[PDB]
Amino acid sequence: GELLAQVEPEDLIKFGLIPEFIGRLPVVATLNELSEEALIQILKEPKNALTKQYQALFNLEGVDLEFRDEALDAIAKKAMARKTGARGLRSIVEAALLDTMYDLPSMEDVEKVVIDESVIDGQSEPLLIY
Amino acid sequence: LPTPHEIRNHLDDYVIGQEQAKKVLAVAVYNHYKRLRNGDTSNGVELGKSNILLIGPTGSGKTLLAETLARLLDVPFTMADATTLTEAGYVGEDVENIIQKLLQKCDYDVQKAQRGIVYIDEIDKISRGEGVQQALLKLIEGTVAAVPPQGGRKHPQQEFLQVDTSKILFICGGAFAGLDKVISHRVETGSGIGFGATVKAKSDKASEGELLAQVEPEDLIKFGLIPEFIGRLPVVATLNELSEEALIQILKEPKNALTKQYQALFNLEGVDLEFRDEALDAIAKKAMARKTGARGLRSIVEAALLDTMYDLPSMEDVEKVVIDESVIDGQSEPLLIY
Amino acid sequence: LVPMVIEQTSRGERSFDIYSRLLKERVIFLTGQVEDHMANLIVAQMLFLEAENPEKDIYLYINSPGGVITAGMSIYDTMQFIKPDVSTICMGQAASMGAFLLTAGAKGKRFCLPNSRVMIHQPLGGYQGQATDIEIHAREILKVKGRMNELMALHTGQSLEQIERDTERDRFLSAPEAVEYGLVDSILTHRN
Amino acid sequence: LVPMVIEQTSRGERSFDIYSRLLKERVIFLTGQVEDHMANLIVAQMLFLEAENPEKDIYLYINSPGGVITAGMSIYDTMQFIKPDVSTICMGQAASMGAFLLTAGAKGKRFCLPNSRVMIHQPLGGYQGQATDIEIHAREILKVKGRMNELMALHTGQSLEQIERDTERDRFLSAPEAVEYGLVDSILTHRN
Amino acid sequence: LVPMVIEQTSRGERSFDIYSRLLKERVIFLTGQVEDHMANLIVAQMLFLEAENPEKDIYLYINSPGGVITAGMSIYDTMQFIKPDVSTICMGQAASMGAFLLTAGAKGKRFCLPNSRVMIHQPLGGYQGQATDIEIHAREILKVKGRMNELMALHTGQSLEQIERDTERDRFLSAPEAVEYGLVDSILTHRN
Numbered sequence A: 001g002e003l004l005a006q007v008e009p010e011d012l013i014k015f016g017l018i019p020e021f022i023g024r025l026p027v028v029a030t031l032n033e034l035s036e037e038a039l040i041q042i043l044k045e046p047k048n049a050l051t052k053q054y055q056a057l058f059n060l061e062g063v064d065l066e067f068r069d070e071a072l073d074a075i076a077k078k079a080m081a082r083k084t085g086a087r088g089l090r091s092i093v094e095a096a097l098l099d100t101m102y103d104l105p106s107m108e109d110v111e112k113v114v115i116d117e118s119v120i121d122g123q124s125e126p127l128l129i130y
Numbered sequence B: 001l002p003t004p005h006e007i008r009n010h011l012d013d014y015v016i017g018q019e020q021a022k023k024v025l026a027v028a029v030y031n032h033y034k035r036l037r038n039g040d041t042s043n044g045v046e047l048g049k050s051n052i053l054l055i056g057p058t059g060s061g062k063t064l065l066a067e068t069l070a071r072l073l074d075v076p077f078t079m080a081d082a083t084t085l086t087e088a089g090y091v092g093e094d095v096e097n098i099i100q101k102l103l104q105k106c107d108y109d110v111q112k113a114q115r116g117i118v119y120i121d122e123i124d125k126i127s128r129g130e131g132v133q134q135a136l137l138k139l140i141e142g143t144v145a146a147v148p149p150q151g152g153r154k155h156p157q158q159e160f161l162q163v164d165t166s167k168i169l170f171i172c173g174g175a176f177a178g179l180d181k182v183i184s185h186r187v188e189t190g191s192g193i194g195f196g197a198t199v200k201a202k203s204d205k206a207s208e209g210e211l212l213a214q215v216e217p218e219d220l221i222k223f224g225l226i227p228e229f230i231g232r233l234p235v236v237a238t239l240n241e242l243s244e245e246a247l248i249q250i251l252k253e254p255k256n257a258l259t260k261q262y263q264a265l266f267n268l269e270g271v272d273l274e275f276r277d278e279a280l281d282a283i284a285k286k287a288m289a290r291k292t293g294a295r296g297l298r299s300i301v302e303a304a305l306l307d308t309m310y311d312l313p314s315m316e317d318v319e320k321v322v323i324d325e326s327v328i329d330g331q332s333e334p335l336l337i338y
Numbered sequence C, D, E: 001l002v003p004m005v006i007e008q009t010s011r012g013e014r015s016f017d018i019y020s021r022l023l024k025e026r027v028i029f030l031t032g033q034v035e036d037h038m039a040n041l042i043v044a045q046m047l048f049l050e051a052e053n054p055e056k057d058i059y060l061y062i063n064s065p066g067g068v069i070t071a072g073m074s075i076y077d078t079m080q081f082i083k084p085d086v087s088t089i090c091m092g093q094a095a096s097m098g099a100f101l102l103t104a105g106a107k108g109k110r111f112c113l114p115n116s117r118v119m120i121h122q123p124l125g126g127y128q129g130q131a132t133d134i135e136i137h138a139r140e141i142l143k144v145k146g147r148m149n150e151l152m153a154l155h156t157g158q159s160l161e162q163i164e165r166d167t168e169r170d171r172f173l174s175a176p177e178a179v180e181y182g183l184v185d186s187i188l189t190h191r192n
Ligand SMILES: Nc1ncnc2c1ncn2[C@@H]1O[C@H](COP(=O)(O)OP(=O)(O)O)[C@@H](O)[C@H]1O
Pocket: B014, B015, B016, B017, B056, B057, B058, B059, B060, B061, B062, B063, B064, B242, B250, B254, B293, B294, B295
């Protein structure tokens, strides 16, 4: 970010693009790596957000999933380090919820499961309500 | 076959400040077309091709001068870069690929392709690959290159179209930044470090204009060009520089001037555009510091007009729009008239 | 011995001496007793850097106890002649001649380390021979004294009378005291 | 004779002297009597390594019987200026200046070998001349004595009064004794 | 240790010592006491530059407290013998032999820095032996004295009588005084 904005035709030619092709494309729209704040919105604001996807998944089993506001910040921080953009979010969620998902069907008396920032770090286990 | 003077007049419309270079290309291109025009060849003498070598700074108008001539005299135009062909592996297929690109524009007509004008740039980079120059000189000297007939799934060796490059005009442009020092050493005093030396590196580069005009074959070999390649480029045209004032003129004086292009876009929208002279110096000054020549002018203007272009269609009651030097800086907003 | 260093460039890895590597970054080291031989070497370094880039500044690191006036004066005239500004930094100490070169640096670019000691004194010399010759040499060294005091006053900003009185005998100035006197401008305590 | 070593790199085999090879690993050797020329060389190495990586820590191996104070201050000021933490290790011995540079290292990164010998004493100097000149130089060395004691108290953590008493005469401290005094932090007995 | 500088051109990159890099620009450095060995080296540089280009001017930077007269004449005769005009710039000072070579430069191409000191005196010599041999050597040094005065008068433009009275004893001169005397043509203060 702040480096691609200074892109010029000479650098594109070195990449392999034909010079005539570059000249024919005067408009250049350069995107920037999503910020922590931007990733937090994608986690909950979209209708098909990652959090809503797992919530529907848990609801199909008879349990409701709740995500704390602090947890979203931690997930966004881990996703930014991965450098995989939005796709990085799924990696963090699957890892944190790997243990509970494996044992949640076998477990009984579990009506609600809650995740917080500490769970994202991995030191703590997903909170279970009985 | 217009006279060289007429050709120079056409170039003056779109290119300004390089009148001397236009004269060299006008006479050189006129001779090339005269030879093609004089296809009868009644005289026993066989006419020889003359290839030009353009030496100028970046964004000085070398590329623009090539296609502009083609616009006057309809001919196919193609451009190539030495860095693309420095691979040194199977160079034969890429040199013929250039004319193939040229053949596309001319409807794959061998006769039309021969009359086409080819352009190259950044020749200084290869000077030091030495091997790359060995293959390049053959293309300038003249060589028959086979090309497939207008693509196709496959075709036999018989159907392959062969176009002679001896009748094609080649312009090997370049920007020799370090050659000026070599000329000063040969022509001026050979002192650059001492008290009496000239180290006035003010970035003006005004002396560079007349200094590069004294280019001779001796300074080129010092740069690394082999003598055989230099011999195939008898004509030499030198561009001096694009000054800050010259950039201001390029913004409006050309026919398809940058300001006119943006002005027309706003005119159809329903609001006219006015470019104050104060705004012009700000744009020209930015380009000089950035070292983009005329190239950066388009980017600087688009960025300044990007915000207004987004809101002007949605907004209304803007009878007229005005721009000033403050707007170029970014602190101010383009003035709106109601 | 001097330790060699490697510099990465587009061509490839290149080997440079520790001093030569810093010279590439416009850094000149003034070390030891000032003499004609080392002074001409510093002069050559300055002229070379001027040609490469007359706009960029030059950094002279001074750690010396002083020396010959003629040799030191060849460095001063070179600094003023060349267009690029010559920044002077004092490391360890800057005696009479080292202090003159230090204060001779570009205005606003003279620096001094916090523990550096700047000492200034008047010229010292001697001659043996006939009385007529002694008169000739005595007048010359006195003229040199006024010349050095005149220039020192210009750079420091103090009056000629004050410089004459202060430099009549050895005067040691710490890095902060030098700032008030005008020999230097700022103290480089820590990198910011 | 300094031996040459081969280093395997991506570009290919490279030849370095034993001292330059260690410099590549951020190791600077401070050996022998401290003086202007050796000190400027060490200063050049610190600045060179700062540019390469200002985050990594630099190491200084001190085995010296002391030397000039002004030359030492150039090294001390450079260490505090640059961002990288300078780790000081005492090999063999560390006298007055070597000890001052040893304790001047980064808090927590000062080390000493088990059989090392550290000695700290007050500054020693002399001047011959007129009584007026003696008073000038006598005041200057006393200022340096106070300044050196003030800095040692800061790094060691001992009171200023205690330092004056101990540094009045030569005091020899072993590696364990130095840890208690505060000159060093820990001892490097064996590789872990 | 002279530093190494890299010259970059299209053909490639070359490493030269600081003195050799300036030699390519027709700059010869005259430093220290004049003698046969150093003078022979300067002579070789003049012949080498003459061969490369007999039209370009040659620069000579002089900073020397005089020396052997015979060694100096080799440099002086060589400068006049070769077609290229040899420019002379005085840095620091120019004593008896240095001043003779300074004023010997091409008319209109003799310069001096503002703070340079120029001193001119008659030859110095001595002989021990028989009275007959003394007369031979005494006549020789007097012939050398008259010859040097004649040449100095020619370059300076002053009368022979005036040069004899002035050179009887040491006569220190300044850069402005040298201009009016005729030893130099102009003063280089700032590049403009
Ligand atoms: N005198 C000029 N008038 C108008 N445009 C110019 C002029 N000089 C350069 N340009 C612009 O520069 C661009 C070409 O830049 P480039 O090919 O990178 O270098 P060069 O200008 O040396 O060929 C063209 O698009 C052209 O619009």
